[PDB]
Coordinates of C-alpha atoms and ligand atoms in Angstrom, one line a residue:
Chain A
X1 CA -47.5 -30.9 14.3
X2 CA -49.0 -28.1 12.6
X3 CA -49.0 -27.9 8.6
X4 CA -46.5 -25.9 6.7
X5 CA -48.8 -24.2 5.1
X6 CA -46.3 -21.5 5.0
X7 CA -45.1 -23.3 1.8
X8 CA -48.4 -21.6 0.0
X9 CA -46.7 -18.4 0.5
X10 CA -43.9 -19.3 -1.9
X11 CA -43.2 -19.1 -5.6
X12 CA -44.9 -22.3 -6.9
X13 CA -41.4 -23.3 -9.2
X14 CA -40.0 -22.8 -5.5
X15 CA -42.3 -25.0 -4.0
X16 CA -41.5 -28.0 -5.9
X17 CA -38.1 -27.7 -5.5
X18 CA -38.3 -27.9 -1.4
X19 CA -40.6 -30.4 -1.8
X20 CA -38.2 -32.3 -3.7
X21 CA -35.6 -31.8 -0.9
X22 CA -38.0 -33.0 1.8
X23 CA -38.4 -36.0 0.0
X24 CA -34.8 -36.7 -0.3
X25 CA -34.3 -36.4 3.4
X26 CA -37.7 -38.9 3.8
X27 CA -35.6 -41.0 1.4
X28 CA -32.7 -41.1 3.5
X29 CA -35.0 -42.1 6.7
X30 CA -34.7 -38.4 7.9
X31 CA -38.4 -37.5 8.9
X32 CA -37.4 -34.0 10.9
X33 CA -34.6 -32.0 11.3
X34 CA -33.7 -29.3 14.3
X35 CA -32.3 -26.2 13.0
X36 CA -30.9 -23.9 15.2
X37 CA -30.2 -20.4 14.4
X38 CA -27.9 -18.3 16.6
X39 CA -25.6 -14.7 16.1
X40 CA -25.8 -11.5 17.1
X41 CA -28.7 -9.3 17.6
X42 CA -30.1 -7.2 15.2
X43 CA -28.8 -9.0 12.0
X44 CA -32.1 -10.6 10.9
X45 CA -31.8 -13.9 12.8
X46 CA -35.9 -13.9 13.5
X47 CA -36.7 -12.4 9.8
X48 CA -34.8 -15.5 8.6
X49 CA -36.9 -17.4 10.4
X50 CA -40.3 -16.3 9.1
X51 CA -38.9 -16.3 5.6
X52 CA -38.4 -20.2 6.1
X53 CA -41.7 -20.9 7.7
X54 CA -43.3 -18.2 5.3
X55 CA -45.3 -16.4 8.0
X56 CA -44.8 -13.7 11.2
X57 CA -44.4 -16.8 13.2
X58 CA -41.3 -14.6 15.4
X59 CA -41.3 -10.9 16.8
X60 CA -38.9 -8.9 14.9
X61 CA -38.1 -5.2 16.3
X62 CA -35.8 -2.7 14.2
X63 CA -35.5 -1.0 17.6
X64 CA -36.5 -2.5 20.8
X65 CA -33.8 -5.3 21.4
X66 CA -35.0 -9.0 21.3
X67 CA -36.4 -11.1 23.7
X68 CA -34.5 -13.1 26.0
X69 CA -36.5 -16.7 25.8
X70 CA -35.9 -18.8 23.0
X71 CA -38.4 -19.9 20.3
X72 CA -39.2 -23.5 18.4
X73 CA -41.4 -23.2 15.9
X74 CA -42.5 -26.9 14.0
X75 CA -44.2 -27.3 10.9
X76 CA -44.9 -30.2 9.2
X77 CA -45.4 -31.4 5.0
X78 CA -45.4 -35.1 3.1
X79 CA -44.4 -36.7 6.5
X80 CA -41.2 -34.5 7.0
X81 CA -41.2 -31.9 10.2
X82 CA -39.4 -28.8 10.4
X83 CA -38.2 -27.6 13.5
X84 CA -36.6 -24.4 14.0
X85 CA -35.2 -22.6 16.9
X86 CA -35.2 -19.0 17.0
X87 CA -32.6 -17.1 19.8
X88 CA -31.7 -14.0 21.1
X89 CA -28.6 -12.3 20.1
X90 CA -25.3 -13.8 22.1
X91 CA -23.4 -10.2 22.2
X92 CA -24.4 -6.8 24.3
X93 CA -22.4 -4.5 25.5
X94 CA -18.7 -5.9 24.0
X95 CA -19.4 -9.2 26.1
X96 CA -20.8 -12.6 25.9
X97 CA -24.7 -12.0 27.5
X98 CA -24.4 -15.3 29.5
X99 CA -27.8 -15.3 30.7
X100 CA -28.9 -15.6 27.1
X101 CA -26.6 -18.3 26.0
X102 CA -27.2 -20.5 29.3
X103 CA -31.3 -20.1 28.7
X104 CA -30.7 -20.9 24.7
X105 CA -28.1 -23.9 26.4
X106 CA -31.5 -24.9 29.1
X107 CA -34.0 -25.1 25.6
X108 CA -31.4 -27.3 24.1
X109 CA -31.3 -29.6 26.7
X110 CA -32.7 -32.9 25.3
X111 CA -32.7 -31.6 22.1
X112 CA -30.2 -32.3 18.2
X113 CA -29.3 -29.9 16.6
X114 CA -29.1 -31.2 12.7
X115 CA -28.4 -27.9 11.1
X116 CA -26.7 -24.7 13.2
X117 CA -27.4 -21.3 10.9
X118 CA -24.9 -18.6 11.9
X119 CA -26.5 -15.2 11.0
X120 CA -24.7 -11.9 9.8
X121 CA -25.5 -9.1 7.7
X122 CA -23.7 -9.1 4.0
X123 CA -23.9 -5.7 4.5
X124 CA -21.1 -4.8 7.0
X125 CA -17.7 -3.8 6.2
X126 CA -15.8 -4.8 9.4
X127 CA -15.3 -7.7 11.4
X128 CA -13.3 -8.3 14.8
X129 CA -13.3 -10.1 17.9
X130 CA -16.8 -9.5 18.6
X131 CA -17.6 -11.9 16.0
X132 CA -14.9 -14.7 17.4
X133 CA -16.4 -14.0 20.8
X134 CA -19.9 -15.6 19.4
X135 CA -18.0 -18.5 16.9
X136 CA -15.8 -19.4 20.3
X137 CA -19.2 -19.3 22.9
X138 CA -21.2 -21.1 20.4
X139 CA -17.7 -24.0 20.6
X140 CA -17.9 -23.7 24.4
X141 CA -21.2 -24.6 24.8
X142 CA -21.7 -27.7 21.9
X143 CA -18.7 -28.6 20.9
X144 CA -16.1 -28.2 17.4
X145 CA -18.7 -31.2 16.4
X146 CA -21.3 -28.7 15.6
X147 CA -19.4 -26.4 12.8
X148 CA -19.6 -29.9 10.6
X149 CA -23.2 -28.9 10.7
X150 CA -23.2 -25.7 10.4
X151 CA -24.0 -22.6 7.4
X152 CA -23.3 -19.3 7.8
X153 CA -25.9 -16.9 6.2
X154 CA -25.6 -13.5 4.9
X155 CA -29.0 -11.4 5.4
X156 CA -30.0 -8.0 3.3
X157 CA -28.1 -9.8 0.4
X158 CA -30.4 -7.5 -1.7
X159 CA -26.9 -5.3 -1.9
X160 CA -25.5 -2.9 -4.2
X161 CA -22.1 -2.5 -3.2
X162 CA -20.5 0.7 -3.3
X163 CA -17.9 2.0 -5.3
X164 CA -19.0 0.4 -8.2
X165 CA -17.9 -3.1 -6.7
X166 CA -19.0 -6.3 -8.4
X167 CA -21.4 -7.8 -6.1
X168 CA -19.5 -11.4 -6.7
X169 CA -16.6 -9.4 -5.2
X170 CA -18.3 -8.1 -2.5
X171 CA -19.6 -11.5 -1.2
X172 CA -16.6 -12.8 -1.6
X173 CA -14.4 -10.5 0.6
X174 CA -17.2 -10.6 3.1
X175 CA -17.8 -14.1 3.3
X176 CA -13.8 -14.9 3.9
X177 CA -13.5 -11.8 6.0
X178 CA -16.3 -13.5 8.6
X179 CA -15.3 -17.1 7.8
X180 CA -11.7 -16.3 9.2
X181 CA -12.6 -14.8 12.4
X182 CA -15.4 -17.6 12.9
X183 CA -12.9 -20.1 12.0
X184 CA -10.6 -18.6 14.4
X185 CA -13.0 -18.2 17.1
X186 CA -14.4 -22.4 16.8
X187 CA -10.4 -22.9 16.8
X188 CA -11.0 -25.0 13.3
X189 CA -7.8 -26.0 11.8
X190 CA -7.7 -25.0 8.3
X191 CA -7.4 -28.3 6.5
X192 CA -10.2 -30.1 8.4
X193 CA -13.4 -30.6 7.0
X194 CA -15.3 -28.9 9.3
X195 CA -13.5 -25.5 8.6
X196 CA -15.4 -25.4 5.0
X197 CA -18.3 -23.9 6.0
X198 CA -20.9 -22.9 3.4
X199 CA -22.3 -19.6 2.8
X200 CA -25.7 -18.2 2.0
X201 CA -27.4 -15.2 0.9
X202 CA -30.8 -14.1 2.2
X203 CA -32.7 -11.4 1.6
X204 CA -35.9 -11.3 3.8
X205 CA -37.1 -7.9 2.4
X206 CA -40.6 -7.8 0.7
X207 CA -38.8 -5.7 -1.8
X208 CA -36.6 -8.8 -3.0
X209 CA -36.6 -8.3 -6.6
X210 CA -38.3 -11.6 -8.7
X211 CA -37.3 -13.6 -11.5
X212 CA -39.9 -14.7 -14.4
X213 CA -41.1 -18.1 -11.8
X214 CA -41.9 -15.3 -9.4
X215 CA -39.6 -16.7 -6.8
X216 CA -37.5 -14.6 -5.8
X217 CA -33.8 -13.9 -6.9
X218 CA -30.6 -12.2 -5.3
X219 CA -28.5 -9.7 -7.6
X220 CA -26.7 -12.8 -8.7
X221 CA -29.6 -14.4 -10.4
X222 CA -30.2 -17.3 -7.4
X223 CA -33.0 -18.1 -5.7
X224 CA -31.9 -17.7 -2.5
X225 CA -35.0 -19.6 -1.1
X226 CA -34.2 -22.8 -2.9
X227 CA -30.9 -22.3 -2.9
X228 CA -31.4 -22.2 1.5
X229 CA -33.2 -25.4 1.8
X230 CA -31.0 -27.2 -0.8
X231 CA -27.7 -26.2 1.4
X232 CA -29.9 -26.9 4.7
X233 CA -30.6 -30.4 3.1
X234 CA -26.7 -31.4 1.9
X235 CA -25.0 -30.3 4.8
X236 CA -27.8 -32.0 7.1
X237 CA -27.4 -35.3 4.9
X238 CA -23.5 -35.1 5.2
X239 CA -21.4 -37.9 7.2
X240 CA -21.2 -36.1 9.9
X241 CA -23.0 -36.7 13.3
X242 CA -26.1 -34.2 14.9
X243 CA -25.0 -32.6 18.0
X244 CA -27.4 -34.3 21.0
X245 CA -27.5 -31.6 24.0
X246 CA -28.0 -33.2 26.9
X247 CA -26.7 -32.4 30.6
X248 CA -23.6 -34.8 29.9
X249 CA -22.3 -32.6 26.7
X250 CA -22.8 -29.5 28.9
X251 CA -20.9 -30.8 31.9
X252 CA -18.1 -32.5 29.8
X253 CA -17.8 -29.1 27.9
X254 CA -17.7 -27.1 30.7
X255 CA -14.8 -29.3 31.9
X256 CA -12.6 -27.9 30.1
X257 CA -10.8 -25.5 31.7
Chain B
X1 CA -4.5 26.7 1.6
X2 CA -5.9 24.4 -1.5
X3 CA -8.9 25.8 -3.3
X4 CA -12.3 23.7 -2.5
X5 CA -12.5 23.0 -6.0
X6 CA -14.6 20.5 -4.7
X7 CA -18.0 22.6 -4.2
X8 CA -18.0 22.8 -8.1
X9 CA -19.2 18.7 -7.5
X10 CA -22.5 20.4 -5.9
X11 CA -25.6 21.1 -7.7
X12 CA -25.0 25.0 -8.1
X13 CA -28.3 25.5 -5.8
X14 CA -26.3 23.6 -3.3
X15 CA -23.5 25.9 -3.8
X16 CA -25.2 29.0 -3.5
X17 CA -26.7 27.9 -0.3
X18 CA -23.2 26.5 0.9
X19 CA -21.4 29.9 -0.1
X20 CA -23.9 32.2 2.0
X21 CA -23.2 29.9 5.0
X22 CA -19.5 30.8 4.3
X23 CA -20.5 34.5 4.1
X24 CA -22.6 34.0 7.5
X25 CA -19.5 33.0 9.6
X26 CA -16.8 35.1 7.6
X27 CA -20.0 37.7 8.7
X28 CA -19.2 36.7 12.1
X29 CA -15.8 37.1 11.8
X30 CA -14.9 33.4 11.7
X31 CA -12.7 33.0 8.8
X32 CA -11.8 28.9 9.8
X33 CA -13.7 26.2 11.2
X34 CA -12.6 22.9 12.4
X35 CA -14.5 19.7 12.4
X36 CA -13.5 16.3 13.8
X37 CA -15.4 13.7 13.1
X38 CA -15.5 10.8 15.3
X39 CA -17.1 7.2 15.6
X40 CA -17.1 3.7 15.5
X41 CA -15.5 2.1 12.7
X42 CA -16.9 1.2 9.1
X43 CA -20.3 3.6 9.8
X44 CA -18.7 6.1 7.1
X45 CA -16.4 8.4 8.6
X46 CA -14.0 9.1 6.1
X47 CA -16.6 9.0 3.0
X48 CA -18.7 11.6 4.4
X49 CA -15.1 13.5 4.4
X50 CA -15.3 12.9 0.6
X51 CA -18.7 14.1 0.2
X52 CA -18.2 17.2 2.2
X53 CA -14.8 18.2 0.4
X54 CA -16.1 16.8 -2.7
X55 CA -13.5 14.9 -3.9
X56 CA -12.0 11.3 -3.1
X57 CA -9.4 13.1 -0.1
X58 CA -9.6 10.3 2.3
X59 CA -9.1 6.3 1.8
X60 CA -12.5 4.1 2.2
X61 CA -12.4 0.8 2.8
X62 CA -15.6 -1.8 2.8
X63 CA -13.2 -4.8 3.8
X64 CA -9.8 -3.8 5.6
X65 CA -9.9 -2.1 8.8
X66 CA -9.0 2.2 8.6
X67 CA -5.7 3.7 9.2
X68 CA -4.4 4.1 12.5
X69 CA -3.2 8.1 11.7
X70 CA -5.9 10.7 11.3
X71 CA -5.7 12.8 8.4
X72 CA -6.7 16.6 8.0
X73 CA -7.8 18.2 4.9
X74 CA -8.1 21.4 4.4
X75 CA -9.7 23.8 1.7
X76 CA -10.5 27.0 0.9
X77 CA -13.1 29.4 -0.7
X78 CA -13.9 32.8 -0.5
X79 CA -11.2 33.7 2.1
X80 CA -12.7 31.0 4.9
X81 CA -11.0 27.9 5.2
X82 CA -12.7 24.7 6.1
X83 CA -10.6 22.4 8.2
X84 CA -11.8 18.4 8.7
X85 CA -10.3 15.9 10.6
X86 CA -10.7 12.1 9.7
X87 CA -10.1 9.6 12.5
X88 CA -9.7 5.7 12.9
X89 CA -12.6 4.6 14.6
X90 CA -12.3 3.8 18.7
X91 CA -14.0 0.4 19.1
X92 CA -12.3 -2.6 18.4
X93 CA -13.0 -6.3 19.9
X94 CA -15.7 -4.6 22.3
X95 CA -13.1 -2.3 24.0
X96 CA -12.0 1.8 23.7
X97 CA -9.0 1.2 20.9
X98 CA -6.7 3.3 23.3
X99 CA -3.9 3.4 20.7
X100 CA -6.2 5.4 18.3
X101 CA -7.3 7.6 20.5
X102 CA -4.4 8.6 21.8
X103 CA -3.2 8.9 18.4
X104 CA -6.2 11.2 17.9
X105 CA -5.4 13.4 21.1
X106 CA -1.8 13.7 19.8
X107 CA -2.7 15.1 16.3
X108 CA -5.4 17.6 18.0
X109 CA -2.4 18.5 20.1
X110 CA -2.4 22.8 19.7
X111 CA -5.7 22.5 17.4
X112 CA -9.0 23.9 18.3
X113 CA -12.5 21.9 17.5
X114 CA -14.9 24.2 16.5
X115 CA -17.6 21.1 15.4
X116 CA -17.7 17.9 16.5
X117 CA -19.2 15.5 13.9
X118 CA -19.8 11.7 15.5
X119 CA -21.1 9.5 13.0
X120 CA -23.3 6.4 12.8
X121 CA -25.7 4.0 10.5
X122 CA -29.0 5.0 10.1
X123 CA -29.6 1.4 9.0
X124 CA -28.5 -0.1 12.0
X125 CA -31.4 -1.3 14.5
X126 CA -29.8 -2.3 18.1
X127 CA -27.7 0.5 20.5
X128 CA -25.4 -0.8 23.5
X129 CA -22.5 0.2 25.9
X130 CA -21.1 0.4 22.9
X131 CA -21.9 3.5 21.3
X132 CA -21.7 4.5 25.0
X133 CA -18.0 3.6 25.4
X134 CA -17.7 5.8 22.5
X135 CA -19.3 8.9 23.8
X136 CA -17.7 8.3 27.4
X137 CA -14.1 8.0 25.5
X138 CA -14.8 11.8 23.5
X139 CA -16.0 13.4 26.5
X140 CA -13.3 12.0 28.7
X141 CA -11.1 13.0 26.2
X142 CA -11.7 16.4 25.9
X143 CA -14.7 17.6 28.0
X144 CA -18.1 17.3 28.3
X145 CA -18.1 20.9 26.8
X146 CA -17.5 19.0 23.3
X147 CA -21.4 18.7 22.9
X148 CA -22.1 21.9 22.9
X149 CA -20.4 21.7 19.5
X150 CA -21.5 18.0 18.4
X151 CA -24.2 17.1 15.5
X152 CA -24.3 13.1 15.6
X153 CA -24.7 12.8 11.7
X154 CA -26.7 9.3 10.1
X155 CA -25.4 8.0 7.0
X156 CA -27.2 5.6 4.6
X157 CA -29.7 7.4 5.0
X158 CA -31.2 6.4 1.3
X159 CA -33.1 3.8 3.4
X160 CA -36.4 2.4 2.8
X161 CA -37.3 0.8 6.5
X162 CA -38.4 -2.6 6.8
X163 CA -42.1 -3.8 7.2
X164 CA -43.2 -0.3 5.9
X165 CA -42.4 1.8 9.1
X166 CA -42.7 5.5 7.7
X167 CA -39.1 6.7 6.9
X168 CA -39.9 9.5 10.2
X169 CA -40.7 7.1 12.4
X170 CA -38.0 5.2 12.0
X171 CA -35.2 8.1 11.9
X172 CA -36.9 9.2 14.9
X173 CA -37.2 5.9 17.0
X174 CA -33.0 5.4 15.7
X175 CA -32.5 8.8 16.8
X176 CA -33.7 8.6 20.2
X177 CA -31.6 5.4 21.1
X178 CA -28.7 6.8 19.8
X179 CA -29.1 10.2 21.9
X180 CA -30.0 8.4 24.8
X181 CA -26.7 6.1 24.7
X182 CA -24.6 8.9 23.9
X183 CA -26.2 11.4 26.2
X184 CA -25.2 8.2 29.4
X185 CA -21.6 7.7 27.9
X186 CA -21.2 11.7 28.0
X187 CA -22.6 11.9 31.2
X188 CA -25.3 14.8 30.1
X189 CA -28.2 15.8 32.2
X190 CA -31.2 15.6 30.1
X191 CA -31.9 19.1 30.8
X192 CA -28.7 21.0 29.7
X193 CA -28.5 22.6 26.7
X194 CA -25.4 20.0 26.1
X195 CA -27.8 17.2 25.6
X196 CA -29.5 18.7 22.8
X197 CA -27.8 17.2 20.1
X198 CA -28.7 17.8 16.6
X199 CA -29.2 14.7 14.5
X200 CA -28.7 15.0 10.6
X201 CA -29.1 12.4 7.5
X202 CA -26.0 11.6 5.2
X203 CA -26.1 9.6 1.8
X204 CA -23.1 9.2 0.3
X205 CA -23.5 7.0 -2.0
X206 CA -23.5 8.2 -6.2
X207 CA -26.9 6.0 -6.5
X208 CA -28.6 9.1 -4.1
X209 CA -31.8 10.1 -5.6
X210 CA -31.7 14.0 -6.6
X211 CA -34.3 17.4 -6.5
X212 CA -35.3 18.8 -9.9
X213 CA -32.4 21.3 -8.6
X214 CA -30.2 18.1 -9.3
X215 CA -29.0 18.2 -5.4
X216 CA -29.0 15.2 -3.7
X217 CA -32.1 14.3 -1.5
X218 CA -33.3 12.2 0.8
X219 CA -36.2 9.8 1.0
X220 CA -37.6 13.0 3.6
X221 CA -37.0 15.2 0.4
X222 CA -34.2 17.1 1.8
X223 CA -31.2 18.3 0.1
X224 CA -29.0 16.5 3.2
X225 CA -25.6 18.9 1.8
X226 CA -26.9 22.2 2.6
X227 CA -28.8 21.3 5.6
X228 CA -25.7 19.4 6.8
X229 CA -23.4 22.7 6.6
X230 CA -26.2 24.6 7.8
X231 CA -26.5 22.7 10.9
X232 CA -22.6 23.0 11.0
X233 CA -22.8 26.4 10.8
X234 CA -25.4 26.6 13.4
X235 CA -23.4 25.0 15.8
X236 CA -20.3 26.8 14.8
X237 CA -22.2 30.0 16.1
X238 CA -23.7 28.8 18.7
X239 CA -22.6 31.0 22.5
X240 CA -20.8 27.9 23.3
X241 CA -16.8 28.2 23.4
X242 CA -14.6 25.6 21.1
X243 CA -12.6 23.1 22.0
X244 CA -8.9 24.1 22.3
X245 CA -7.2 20.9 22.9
X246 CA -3.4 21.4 24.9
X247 CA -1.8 19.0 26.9
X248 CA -3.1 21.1 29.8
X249 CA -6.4 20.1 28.7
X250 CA -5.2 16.6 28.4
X251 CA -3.7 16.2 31.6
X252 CA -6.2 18.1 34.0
X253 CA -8.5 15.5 32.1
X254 CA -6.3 12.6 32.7
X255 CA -6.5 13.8 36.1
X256 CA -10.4 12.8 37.1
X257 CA -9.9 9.6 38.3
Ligands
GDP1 N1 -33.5 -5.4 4.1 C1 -33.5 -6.3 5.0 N2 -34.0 -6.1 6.3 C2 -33.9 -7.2 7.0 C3 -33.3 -8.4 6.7 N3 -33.3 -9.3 7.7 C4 -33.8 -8.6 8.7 N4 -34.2 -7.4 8.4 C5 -34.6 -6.3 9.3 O1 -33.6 -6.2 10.3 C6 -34.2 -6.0 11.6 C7 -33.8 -7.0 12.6 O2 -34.3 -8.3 12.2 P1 -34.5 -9.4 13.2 O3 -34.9 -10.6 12.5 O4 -35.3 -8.9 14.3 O5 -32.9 -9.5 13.7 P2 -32.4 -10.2 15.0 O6 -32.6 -9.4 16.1 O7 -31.0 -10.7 14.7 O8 -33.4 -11.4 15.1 C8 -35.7 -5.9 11.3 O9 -36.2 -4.6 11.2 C9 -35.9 -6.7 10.0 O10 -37.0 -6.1 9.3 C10 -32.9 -8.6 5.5 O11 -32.5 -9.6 5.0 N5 -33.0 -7.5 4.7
GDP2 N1 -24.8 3.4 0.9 C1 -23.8 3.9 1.6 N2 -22.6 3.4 1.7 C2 -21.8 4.3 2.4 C3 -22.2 5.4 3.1 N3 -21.2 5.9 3.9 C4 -20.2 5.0 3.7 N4 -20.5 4.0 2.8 C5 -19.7 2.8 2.6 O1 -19.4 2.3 3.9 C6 -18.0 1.8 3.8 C7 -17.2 2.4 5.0 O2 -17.1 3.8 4.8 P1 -16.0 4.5 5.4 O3 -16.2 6.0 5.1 O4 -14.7 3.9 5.0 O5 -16.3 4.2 7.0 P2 -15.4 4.4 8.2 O6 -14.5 3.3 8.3 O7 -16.2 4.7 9.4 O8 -14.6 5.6 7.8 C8 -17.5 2.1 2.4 O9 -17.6 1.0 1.6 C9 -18.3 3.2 2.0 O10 -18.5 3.1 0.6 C10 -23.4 5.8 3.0 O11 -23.8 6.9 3.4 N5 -24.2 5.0 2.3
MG3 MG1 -34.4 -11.8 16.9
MG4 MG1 -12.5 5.6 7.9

């Protein structure tokens, strides 16, 4: 219920643009949206989060690991409200933590999940079962349904790879690197739809270089802001249905044995 | 038996202070020094192999996973002979990769460790059993004694830390999780020497900022190379005994259950 004024804090040229989006999804009868965002810990799931509400509305900790209750944070603009769900990280220790994902599951309940933002950092250079682990738990507990909804974003995208890489290059090798084992991990055959999951760059650094509209750009020349919301908006305006938690879903899910 | 050709890479103040640690420990009558270096995988093992040889001796790879045999170079210069072991790091899927470490036990087979080196991100901001595993694995491996010879070394350490946390504080708060993780796995009481572990900053990336010396520094304006073999050859002449690994060592290890 409370204003977005968060939207002040960005680059006016990227103002317009979101506004523009919200009024697409107005225009298609979609006056809110649920986005959930879920990964490990540490790979700037809660920075994202203030980056899209455009204030410290989340704790963040470079240290100190995160908290274990989940977070919704709702702003509103033109008629159109936000909702975004902030967790703590799925893996500790090499394992599922199952108190986390059964509290994030108990937040859910009642709840539709429009948009589901898997978080990583561009950054890393490996990826392995770990990874599956969260892609498979995150299947477990909503349902295949949910990838159709789903973008995978790439944080400290503010990267200069090393050895001289091209940064296109690095993304690229990245992105399928994680896509696989994620893919593997939902068990998404390759051919269907929901497989082709999009990929985003974020770079929630204050440090995040600008381009001459002030807003501010990755090392591939994209706003990554607009760029965010626009993806947010298409994938939450696809065919596909919202995943509705409710104690039926959980149950059925958990079924399977 | 190769030259370290390699040292003429270093900014000649580096190599002047490089050369009369060589003199120190020749001094000492230690004319060869062994140093394994140990850790996770993808945390920059094998580069900071490179940037210690000073040359491209060891494959890197930001994508595909390491090598499953560990490779030893070996230089020389000024009748001392510097001896470093790359390895294949020991976690995969959240468990101890027991065919690499065995692998690893195998090639140290008849070799003596005279430094260990176990290496991590500085950039990295959560610690779990993890890093613990790790530590447990090394000391399990080939004795507690091992620390009295280990220097955990932090690479990327051309960091600027987020929401402007002073460089310090954040090597310091990093630091302290890793010791304390790594000081559990290894079974070290706080107040042995053993637990003492030094903690030094690696960059090696070409994009490192440089001293008017032209040696490479850190954002702490250190020249990380000298202090890094300094510390190394600190440790090397530290009272404690090396590491000769037999399989008598092996086995009476094998033997705690
Ligand atoms: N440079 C950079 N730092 C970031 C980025 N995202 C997160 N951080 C830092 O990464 C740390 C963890 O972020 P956080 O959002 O708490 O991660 P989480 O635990 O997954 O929620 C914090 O110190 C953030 O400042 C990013 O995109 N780039
Ligand atoms: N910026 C930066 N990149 C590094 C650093 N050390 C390693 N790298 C990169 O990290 C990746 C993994 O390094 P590598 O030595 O192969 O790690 P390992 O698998 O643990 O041996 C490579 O792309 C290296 O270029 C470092 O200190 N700083
Ligand atoms: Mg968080
Ligand atoms: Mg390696």
């Amino acid at each position: 219920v409370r204003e977005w004024s968060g939207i002040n804090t960005f680059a006016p040229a990227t103002q317009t643009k979101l506004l523009e989006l919200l009024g697409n999804l107005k225009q298609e009868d979609v006056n809110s949206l649920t986005i959930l965002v879920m990964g490990k810990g540490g790979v700037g799931k809660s920075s994202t989060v203030n980056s899209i509400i455009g204030e410290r509305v989340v704790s963040i900790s470079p240290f100190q690991s995160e908290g274990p209750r989940p977070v919704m944070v709702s702003r509103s603009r033109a008629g159109f409200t936000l909702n975004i769900i902030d967790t703590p990280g799925l893996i500790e220790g090499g394992y599922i933590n199952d108190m986390a994902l059964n509290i994030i599951k108990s937040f859910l309940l009642d709840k539709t999940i429009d948009v589901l933002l898997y978080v990583d950092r561009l950054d890393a250079y490996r990826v392995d079962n770990l990874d599956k682990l969260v892609a498979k738990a995150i299947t477990d507990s909503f349902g295949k349904g949910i990838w159709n909804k789903a973008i995978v974003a790439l944080t400290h995208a503010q990267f200069s790879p090393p050895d001289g890489l091209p940064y296109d290059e690095f993304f690229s090798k990245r992105s399928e690197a994680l896509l696989q084992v994620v893919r593997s991990g939902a068990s998404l055959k390759k051919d269907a739809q929901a497989s082709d999951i999009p990929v985003v760059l974020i770079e929630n650094s204050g440090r995040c270089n600008k381009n001459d509209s002030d807003e501010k750009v990755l090392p591939n020349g994209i706003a990554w802001i607009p760029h965010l919301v626009q993806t947010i908006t298409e994938v939450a305006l696809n065919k596909s249905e919202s995943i509705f938690v409710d104690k039926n879903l959980i149950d059925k899910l958990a079924a399977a044995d």
